[PDB]
């Protein structure tokens, strides 16, 4: 086929990140993802105002039952993590974006000290997958920006 090596939009290589919880687990994941892509993060109080701002919003995690055994006991769980955000282009309007991560696993009977280490690892991985989805939606913001 006619494949070719691929040649973040260039208009967003310097941007401000606001989250309300800058030391939280989601903002740390987002900053790492906007570091592997050559993006310089400016402080919230920059004198410059010609840079886009990514504002991380509410995050919701929901875990429910997906399957049952023949006795009705919970077999599998499903977790869905939803992340909201907005990108402000100065002069332009607000472009909201969002992410939705899915993860299924078995309810394994463990001691609760060992069992919350497993849950604290699943949620940490869902923060990295949600941050990646928010970076793949930046090219679609630039397209909407150019009406």
């Amino acid at each position: 086929c006619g494949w070719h090596l691929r040649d973040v939009p260039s208009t967003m290589k310097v941007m401000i990140l606001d989250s309300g919880d800058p030391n939280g687990p989601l903002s740390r994941a987002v900053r790492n993802q906007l570091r592997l892509n050559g993006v310089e993060l400016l402080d919230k109080e920059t004198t410059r105002k010609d840079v886009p701002s990514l504002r991380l919003g509410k995050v919701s995690i929901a875990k429910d039952t997906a399957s049952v055994f023949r006795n009705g006991q919970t077999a599998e769980y499903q977790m869905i993590m939803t992340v909201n955000a907005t990108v402000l282009i100065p002069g332009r309007d607000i472009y909201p974006i969002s992410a939705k991560v899915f993860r299924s696993f078995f309810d394994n009977p463990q001691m609760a000290l060992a069992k919350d280490n497993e849950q604290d690892m699943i949620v940490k991985e869902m923060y990295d997958r949600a941050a990646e989805q928010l970076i793949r939606k930046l090219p679609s913001i630039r397209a909407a920006d150019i009406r």
Partner: peptide, 16 residues
């Protein structure tokens, strides 16, 4: 073994 349990894997867990 105080607080270690086996992790279940998905596609994204192959690189864990």
């Amino acid at each position: 073994n105080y607080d270690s349990s086996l992790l279940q894997s998905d596609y994204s867990g192959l690189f864990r």
